[PDB]
Structure formats: structure tokens, C-alpha cells
Amino acid sequence: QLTPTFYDNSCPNVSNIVRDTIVNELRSDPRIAASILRLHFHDCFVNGCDASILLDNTTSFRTEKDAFGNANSARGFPVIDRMKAAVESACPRTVSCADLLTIAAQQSVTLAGGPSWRVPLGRRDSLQAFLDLANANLPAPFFTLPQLKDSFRNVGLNRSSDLVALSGGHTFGKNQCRFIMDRLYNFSNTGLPDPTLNTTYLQTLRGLCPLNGNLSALVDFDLRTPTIFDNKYYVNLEEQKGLIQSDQELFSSPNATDTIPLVRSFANSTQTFFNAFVEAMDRMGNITPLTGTQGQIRLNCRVVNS
């Protein structure tokens, strides 16, 4: 069983070391908090939160970093290396990369203005990476609501609250133009923009992502508060201003009878959202963890111990 007090004796300063690292990095890279939270999400959705995503290539298995959902998208790996080295210095061979990334995600959310809580700990590190599983399990921005629900249920999150609350991770961070081009110019081969995208916002996004323009150009997920972790993400959805298809579908999909009330509840109360986010975050962090003597306490998050 995972427990928040796992390192209270062996490494009481772990959370503070992680926090210090992120604070330092945020000065030169204001996007790092968002990037780190996403790394935890992509770790947990592939064989559970086992730091499998942090492993680099080997001749026996491919890295998840080359998965369609990670390649030229996932970032912040050097920052994780930095905090790992710092923690290893303070507490040698004690904190797993899986737990380190979980704490990093929570601290990132808190630093960006989100809720503060102690995450369950005790996870251990994988002995391999899963590229095929990552390609199959990570959801995509073009997924319909039923597909999004399927993707979450596939890894163990059955609740619509899990989906709606965790999607709130898009209250900050960046998104490449490539992922919304269809919504802006030719959605579902209709030759027209996605009708669920506010027409005023449509104009703005078209200006940032012109047809035949730089597809790697970055756009803010939350037009209200781009770098602050708050419930503004849901207020946007209510106004048809969700950035990607998967965001807006939570409010506009024909299958959103169960998600619409959740979107409204989170937009109406920061407390309601934050409570649900913590609840969902801990549920995601509890996905098929390796515990006890299973797996290892990786010394270098990029490679399995030898």
C-alpha cells in the first residue's frame, strides 16, 4: 500500500529538494511546472507510475520518448536528472525515480498556484520501457469523448470525474499548432472549422496558427491564465474556448451528459476543482505501481541499475 509518509525517516527532505529544484528552473523556464506534471501523467498511463518513461534507448527495448505522444513534445528530462542527483546526494539509493516524478508533479502544481497535498509514496522503478504500450495507451487530442473515456478506463480510471478533473492539467502549459489545425481549417473532412470552437477565439487561433504555417509554434492551453494552475480551464470550456478537441468535448460532446455537470461544478468553484484534482491525481498515481521488493530504486533515472 502506498503511503504519504514513506520517506519521513529515510529522506525527510526529499519534497523540499524537489521543490527547490523546480523553483530554480522556473526562473529560466516558466513552462517547466507544466512539463513535469505531464511527464507524471504519461508515466502513469503506461504500465503505471514506474518511471518507465524516463528510460533511454537500449538494444533490447525502445524508449517511450519516441512514442507519438512523447516525441518532440515531452520535455524536462534534464530537470528530473538534476533533482534526482540532488536527492541521491542527500539520501543515497533511497528515493525511486517513480516517486521522485510523482512528488515533482505535485510540487509543480502547488508552485503554479494549485492545491498542496502529500502524495502517496512507495513506488519502485521499472526494469524496462514500453514504447508500444505508450503508443497504444496515451490519449490523443483528436480523440472523441468516448475514446477519451476508453483511454482512461483502459489504465484503471473508470470515473468521469477522473477524466474531467485531470484534464484540468491544461489550465497551464503549451500546445503545438499541429494539434489544432484541423479544428481551425478542416475538421473531420468537412472543409470547415470545428463548430464547437468559439468563432472569435477561432480568429485568434488562426492568427497564431495560419494554414501552411509553422506547425511547431506553441499556443497557450488556457487563454485566461496561461501559467497559473486554477479552474479557469473550465470557464473556457463553458464559452467554447477549450483549445484542443479533447478539451472542448468534455463540454460539447453528444456523449457529455455526465461530464457537463462536472465541468460546470469545477468552473463554479475552485475548491470543488482542487479537491477533485487531488482525488484524481492520487488515483492516477495509484495505477499499477511496483512496490516492496519489486523493481528497483534506480540510481540514474535514464538507465536500469546494473
- Contacts with ligand HEM, residue ranges (CB under 6 A): 31, 34-35, 37-38, 41, 73, 75, 139-141, 143, 148, 166-167, 169-170, 173-176, 179, 244, 246
Partner that binds at residue 170, options Ca ion, ligand HEM, none, CB closer than 5 to 8 Å by kind: ligand HEM
225 among the known binding-site residues?
yes
Q: Element (H or E) spanning 216, and its range? A: none
Report the SS3 class of residue 290.
strand
Q: How far is CA 78 from CA 41, 71, 149, 219, in A?
A: 17, 15, 32, 23
Interface with Ca ion (CB under 5 A): 43, 46-47, 50, 52, 171, 222, 225, 228, 230, 232
Nearer to Ca ion, 102 or 171 (CB): 171
The distance of closest approach from Cβ of residue 102 to ligand HEM in the complex, given in angstroms and rounded to an integer, is 12
- Rounded CA gap, 125 and 302, in Å? 11
The distance of closest approach from Cβ of residue 245 to ligand HEM in the complex, given in angstroms and rounded to an integer, is 8
Q: How far is CA 160 from CA 253, 255, 258, in A?
A: 13, 11, 7
Angle, vertex CA 176, rays to CA 175 and CA 180, nearest 5: 90
- Rounded CA gap, 277 and 289, in Å? 20
Nearer to ligand HEM, 137 or 175 (CB): 175
Distance of CA 104 to the CA centre of its chain: 12
End-to-end CA distance of the chain: 27
110 among the known binding-site residues?
no
Nearer to Ca ion, 130 or 179 (CB): 130
Grid cell 499556443 is found at 219
Nearer to ligand HEM, 281 or 290 (CB): 281
52 among the known binding-site residues?
yes
Residue ranges for the binding site?
A: 43, 46, 48, 50, 52, 64, 139, 170-171, 222, 225, 230
> Binding site for substrate, residues?
139
